[PDB]
RNA sequence: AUGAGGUGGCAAGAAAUGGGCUACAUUUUCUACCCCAGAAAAACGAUAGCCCUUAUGAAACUUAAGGGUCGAAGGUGGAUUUAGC
C-alpha cells in the first residue's frame, strides 16, 4: 500500500518522537495506553471519593 | 463513622483497589497483549484472579458522599440528586442556578 | 495550586525562519506530518509528556533540534522515492513528458520528416509553455485560467487551431 | 523521563520480551504523572517477574537475559 | 431555425440558431447515447432540433481541419453539470456520421462500472471480468449505427470463442459483431476484438474512425462492483474498461477521439466537481494527456432567446404567462441560463 | 406564535402596489395609509411573486408532502404536471385536426378543472345528515380524495407521477374512482335526504 | 441478631397488558452524491434466532459493537384511543 519511502519516514518519525517503532496489533497496543494513563484506582477522584 | 455499612464497604473497596492498583496494572498488562507466550498469559490470568476480590476496580460504586445514595449521583459534585438540589436551591453552591431558556 | 494543564508547552516556529534547503524542508515536513501547517508555514510542537513545565519545554526544544538535524541528514532509503512520494509534481521524467515526447515522435513519423531528436523537440518554446501549463494545473490552483493555458499550449503543440 | 529504554539493559535485545518491554517503556514515557522512580519501579517489577518465570520462558523457547 | 440542416456547412453565423436532425438520421445514428430527457423531448415533439453552440462549432472546425496522418487527437468536452456536453458530443457524432466515419460511440461509460449482476471472470483472461449484458447491449446499437462499414472490415487473426468455434482471418467484422450479439457469453470478447480491429484498421487507412466516449472519467474512477468475497473491483479489471483505455491511448491515427466529462452518474465525486483533473483524477488526466479541453457553459442571451423561441413555437410552454417577458426573465433567473435546468423547468410549464 | 397579535400577514401582489392612487377609493386609501404603521410578518418561504405561482398546486404539494419532505413533494408535483402535458401532446398529435381543437394541453388548466369536477357539492355531518359544504371544505375534500386515491394500494409498483396524471386526466374527463367517490357521497346524501330536518342550522 | 462479614445463587415465561422502536415499501430499497444519476422491485421486512470476532471487565451465553449465517411474522391494522394551533 504505502511506498517504502513513506513507511521508513513514518518509522523514523516515530523513533524521533518516542512513539512505538515496531509494528503492533490493536490488542497489544492496549499496553501503551494502560501505562500512559494512571490506573482508575490511583486517580484522586477514585481513591479519595469520600471525605 | 460513615453514613452506612454500604458506604463503609465501598470505602474498604476503594482503599483495597488503591493498594493493589499497581500490581493489578502490572499483571493485567501481560494478559492484555498478544506478544508474550500463551502459557505466560495463562499464569498471569490465574495470578490476577488470585488477587483479592475487593481489589477489582469494577466493584467500586460511586455513592453520594453525604447520604450514600447508590444511584443518581452527579460525578462532578459527588452528591445525590436530592442533596445537590437541597444545596443548590438554598444557594450554597457557587454559580449553579435554576435554568430557564 | 496544582493544575495538570499547566505542564503543556507549545513551540511554534516558521520553517522559513530556519536554515533549510528544499530537500531538508520537505523531509522535515514529511517527518512532522500534521504538526506543520502549510498555510502559515508554521511547525507547532505540543509537549505534555513530562510532568513539569521546564521538562516539557526542554523536550520541545530537543524535539526541534533532533528534527532539524535529522532533516538535514540524508538517508539511503530516500533514493527509493515513488513518484507519488513527492508533495510537488515534477514535469521532468513525468508521464506528461513521456506522452508528449511520444506524440511528437509519432507526428514527425507521420510527416515522414524524421529529422528530429528528443532534446531538440523538448527544447522548443512550445514545450516550455506546455510544461508551464502542466505544472500550473498539477501544483497550482485548478481553474479555467489554467485550463485555457493548457488548451492553448496543447493546441500549438498538436498543430490544430 | 522519556528515554527509559536505557533501563532495559537486563532484558533480551530481541524477542517477545523485548517487544513487550518496548511497549511498556513507551507507555511509561508517555505517562506524565508517574515519577521517574515509579517508572523505574515498574520496569524493575517486570524484570523480577520475568526472572522468576524464567522456567516458563525457557519451556516456551523465549531466550531470557 | 436554420435553413442549413447540414452538420458540416453550418458555421458561426448559425450560432444560437437551430439545426434539425431527421428521424431517419436519429434511428441510424443514435440508437443510444442521447440524454434521456432529450430523447423524451424528441418523442414528444416529433423533432430533434439542436442549437448550434460555440463549443460544438469549435470542435467541428477542429475535426474538419484535422490531418489524419498525425496520431488521433483527444478533445475533451468539459464544463459544468447539464451544460450540453452530451448533446455537443451528439452533434459532433451526427456530423461525422454524415461525413461517413465509423463512429465508435460509448453512450455512457458510467453504466459499465455499477449495478452489473452478470459480472463474471473473463474466460479468455482470468485476471479480468466480463460484463456480457452491457457488452451485448452496446454491440447491438453499434451494429445499428455502423452496419454499412461493418462488412468491409477484414479481421486479421483467428479468434476462438470455444475449443470448437472460431472466426478466421479475412472474415468480415460483422461476423464477430454477430457472434458477440448472439452468444452473450462472448459479447465482451467480441467488443474487445472490435475495438482492436477498429483501432488498427484506422491506422491502416481502411476508414476514418471517430471514438466518442461520454463520461470518460469513469475509465479511472473507482467502481462500485464487488467480487464474490464482497471486495471492490478496480476499473482496469473490467475487460470493457481495459479495452476502452487501450482505445483512448493515442497510439494510432486515421481518426479522432472526443470524450465528454460528466459528473452525473460518476462514482465517488462531489456534485460541484466540474474541473478536468478533479473529475478524471490524476491517473485519468495523465492517461488522456495531452488533450484539448473544450468548455461548454450556460446559454448566452441569444442562445436563451433561441431556446425559448423553440419552446414557444412547439407550444411546450403552455403556461398562460410564459410568453410574457416577465416569465422569460423568471425562467432566465431560475435556470441561470443552464440548459438542463431550463429544460427541466419548462418541462412542467 | 412568536409573532405578536399586532403583526399582519404579508400581501404579496405586485399589481396591488402598482395600482394608481386615483383608482383607489377612500377606504382603500385609508387601508394603504394604515398599513404603513403596522408590522408585517416575514413572507413565508413557500409563496413568492413569481407569475408561475399557483396556490392550488402549492396546497396540493403541501398535502402530498410526507414528513416535511417538501423537495420530494415538489418533485412529484412537477413530474405529474410534465406527464400530463406529455400525454396531452401525444394525444394531440395522434388526433385528427378536428379533435385537436378539443384536446387541451395546458396542465394547469387540466389540474384545476379536474379538481373542480372532483369537488363535492353536499356533504354529510353527524347531527348523519346531508348538509351544505363551504367552499374551503369542498376544495380540501377534492384534494384529499385525489391524493388518497393515488396512494391506494390497489396500484402495484406504479409511480405517483404516472398514477396522479392518469387520475387527473380521468377526473378532467369526468371519470375515475374520484368521481365515483363524489357520486357515492351525493347518493348517500340523497338517501339521507329525509333526515335533513335534523339539522338545526 | 430483625445486626455485621464472606462464598454462591434468581432475573425464566403458562398468559396477559402499557409504552417505545423497526416495519409492512414505489413519496419505497441499494449504490454515488448529499438532492438534475444508475440499478431493485415478490422483493420489502428483524436491533429477532445461530456461529465467529472485537470493546470493557478478575470473570461476557449474560453487556455492547462488528462480521458472518437466516430472509422470519406482517401487507396500514375493530370497537376504542393518544398528541399536536
Ligand atoms: N446544445 C443544446 N441544444 C439543445 N438542447 C440542449 C443543448 N445543450 C443542452 N440542452 C438541453 O439540456 C439537456 C442536455 O444537457 P446534457 O445532457 O448535455 O448535460 P451535460 O451538462 O453535458 O452533463 P450532465 O447533465 O450529465 O452533467 C437537454 O434537456 C437539452 O434540451
Ligand atoms: N476470446 C477472444 N478474445 C480475443 C481474442 N483476440 C482478442 N480478443 C479480445 O481482445 C483482448 C486481447 O487484446 P490484445 O490487444 O491482444 O491485448 P490484451 O488484452 O492485453 O491481451 C481479449 O481479452 C479479448 O477481449 C481471441 O482470439 N479470443
Ligand atoms: K397500528
Ligand atoms: Mg458499576
Ligand atoms: Mg450531459
Ligand atoms: Mg441479617
Ligand atoms: Mg442480526
Ligand atoms: Mg478479554
Ligand atoms: Mg431481502
PDB file of C-alpha atoms and ligand atoms in Angstrom, chain E residues 122-125 128 130 157-161 186 188-194 196 239 242-243 246, ligand 2:
ATOM      1  CA  UNK E 122     -13.310 -13.410 -18.216  1.00  0.00           C
ATOM      2  CA  UNK E 123     -12.630 -16.873 -19.617  1.00  0.00           C
ATOM      3  CA  UNK E 124     -10.067 -15.547 -22.102  1.00  0.00           C
ATOM      4  CA  UNK E 125      -8.166 -13.939 -19.211  1.00  0.00           C
ATOM      5  CA  UNK E 128     -10.223  -9.569 -15.871  1.00  0.00           C
ATOM      6  CA  UNK E 130     -16.620  -9.560 -18.365  1.00  0.00           C
ATOM      7  CA  UNK E 157      -6.349 -13.025 -36.709  1.00  0.00           C
ATOM      8  CA  UNK E 158      -8.162 -16.174 -35.592  1.00  0.00           C
ATOM      9  CA  UNK E 159     -10.443 -15.635 -32.594  1.00  0.00           C
ATOM     10  CA  UNK E 160     -11.628 -18.765 -30.787  1.00  0.00           C
ATOM     11  CA  UNK E 161     -14.932 -18.496 -28.940  1.00  0.00           C
ATOM     12  CA  UNK E 186     -18.727 -13.983 -25.826  1.00  0.00           C
ATOM     13  CA  UNK E 188     -17.260  -8.830 -24.023  1.00  0.00           C
ATOM     14  CA  UNK E 189     -14.553 -10.610 -26.017  1.00  0.00           C
ATOM     15  CA  UNK E 190     -16.308  -9.553 -29.221  1.00  0.00           C
ATOM     16  CA  UNK E 191     -16.283  -5.933 -28.032  1.00  0.00           C
ATOM     17  CA  UNK E 192     -12.572  -6.172 -27.284  1.00  0.00           C
ATOM     18  CA  UNK E 193     -11.831  -7.671 -30.696  1.00  0.00           C
ATOM     19  CA  UNK E 194     -13.921  -4.945 -32.329  1.00  0.00           C
ATOM     20  CA  UNK E 196      -8.683  -3.771 -31.516  1.00  0.00           C
ATOM     21  CA  UNK E 239     -12.412  -6.059 -19.875  1.00  0.00           C
ATOM     22  CA  UNK E 242      -9.344  -2.110 -20.232  1.00  0.00           C
ATOM     23  CA  UNK E 243     -10.057  -2.179 -23.966  1.00  0.00           C
ATOM     24  CA  UNK E 246      -6.364   0.990 -24.884  1.00  0.00           C
TER      25      UNK E 246
HETATM   26  N1  LIG H   2     -11.931 -14.723 -26.893  1.00  0.00           N
HETATM   27  C1  LIG H   2     -11.018 -13.988 -27.541  1.00  0.00           C
HETATM   28  N2  LIG H   2     -10.920 -12.684 -27.294  1.00  0.00           N
HETATM   29  C2  LIG H   2      -9.947 -12.093 -28.027  1.00  0.00           C
HETATM   30  C3  LIG H   2      -9.115 -12.678 -28.955  1.00  0.00           C
HETATM   31  N3  LIG H   2      -8.254 -11.736 -29.502  1.00  0.00           N
HETATM   32  C4  LIG H   2      -8.583 -10.616 -28.907  1.00  0.00           C
HETATM   33  N4  LIG H   2      -9.612 -10.758 -28.013  1.00  0.00           N
HETATM   34  C5  LIG H   2     -10.178  -9.697 -27.193  1.00  0.00           C
HETATM   35  O1  LIG H   2      -9.206  -8.690 -27.057  1.00  0.00           O
HETATM   36  C6  LIG H   2      -8.433  -8.929 -25.852  1.00  0.00           C
HETATM   37  C7  LIG H   2      -6.983  -9.083 -26.230  1.00  0.00           C
HETATM   38  O2  LIG H   2      -6.466  -7.793 -26.640  1.00  0.00           O
HETATM   39  P1  LIG H   2      -4.923  -7.665 -27.047  1.00  0.00           P
HETATM   40  O3  LIG H   2      -4.734  -6.443 -27.880  1.00  0.00           O
HETATM   41  O4  LIG H   2      -4.435  -8.975 -27.563  1.00  0.00           O
HETATM   42  O5  LIG H   2      -4.231  -7.390 -25.633  1.00  0.00           O
HETATM   43  P2  LIG H   2      -4.526  -7.991 -24.181  1.00  0.00           P
HETATM   44  O6  LIG H   2      -5.954  -7.619 -23.883  1.00  0.00           O
HETATM   45  O7  LIG H   2      -3.541  -7.336 -23.249  1.00  0.00           O
HETATM   46  O8  LIG H   2      -4.320  -9.475 -24.311  1.00  0.00           O
HETATM   47  C8  LIG H   2      -9.086 -10.148 -25.183  1.00  0.00           C
HETATM   48  O9  LIG H   2      -9.101 -10.021 -23.767  1.00  0.00           O
HETATM   49  C9  LIG H   2     -10.498 -10.118 -25.767  1.00  0.00           C
HETATM   50  O10 LIG H   2     -11.331  -9.178 -25.127  1.00  0.00           O
HETATM   51  C10 LIG H   2      -9.225 -14.065 -29.217  1.00  0.00           C
HETATM   52  O11 LIG H   2      -8.561 -14.751 -30.006  1.00  0.00           O
HETATM   53  N5  LIG H   2     -10.227 -14.652 -28.446  1.00  0.00           N
END
